[PDB]
Ligand binder design. Structure first.
Ligand SMILES: CCCCCCCCO[C@@H]1O[C@H](CO)[C@@H](O)[C@H](O)[C@H]1O
Ligand SMILES: CCCCCCCCO[C@@H]1O[C@H](CO)[C@@H](O)[C@H](O)[C@H]1O
Lengths: 107, 107
């Protein structure tokens, strides 16, 4: 089962957090991260294609995030606006996609 | 701007409806249709890989739908359960994705 978790879970303003990703499925094309609890184009942070290793920003991209080839997302110089939920959609080769939501809490 | 519309808009129970799709972006991996107004894995009707022209059913597939290469969705022998909103997500080759919602009304 695809899941994500934040390290750390409670994050001091101005520090760093890594969203770790567990149990990627076999046979995927790539990753799409979104701010909030659902898949929503208007809140897309980044898209990443695992075949070319290319990252492309979406409308909610801050410039402070880095995605890794295993879909883990690093956020640096974390702000109040970064707090709360994130949603990872994994795009499967058959287009029957999977999603996981995680969160962290800025203080 | 990606949009969809139903032909016909008001559809008699037991007849047929075609969801037409306008203004697909270029450079696409595939299409995913969902029942309702959002992208939600539990309500996915079909996923379609453009590279192979191959359709795979999701959990909401009824067996009465057919999807075409330009993302149009035909539904035959329409039921009451088919009424209302449908959402199409288009997966671009950069994994920055677009969605459009439409509806039809069964009587
Ligand atoms: C600056 C730190 C760079 C982070 C590099 C990628 C870290 C990813 O690390 C990987 O995380 C996966 C999800 O993250 C976990 O499932 C794995 O245990 C781990 O191998
Ligand atoms: C019974 C068989 C149904 C025919 C399925 C193919 C119909 C595809 O529908 C398409 O929607 C587009 C909207 O831009 C139009 O521009 C295309 O020309 C139209 O054919």
């Amino acid at each position: 089962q695809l899941t994500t978790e934040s390290m750390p879970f409670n994050v001091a303003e101005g520090k760093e957090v890594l969203l770790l990703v567990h149990n990627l499925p076999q046979q995927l094309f790539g990753y799409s991260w979104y701010k909030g609890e659902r898949v929503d184009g208007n809140r897309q942070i980044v898209g990443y294609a695992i075949g070319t290793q290319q990252a492309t920003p979406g409308p909610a991209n801050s410039g402070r995030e880095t995605i890794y080839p295993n879909a883990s997302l690093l956020i640096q110089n974390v702000t109040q606006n970064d707090t709360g939920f994130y949603t990872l959609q994994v795009i499967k080769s058959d287009l029957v996609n999977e999603a996981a939501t995680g969160q962290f809490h800025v203080y």
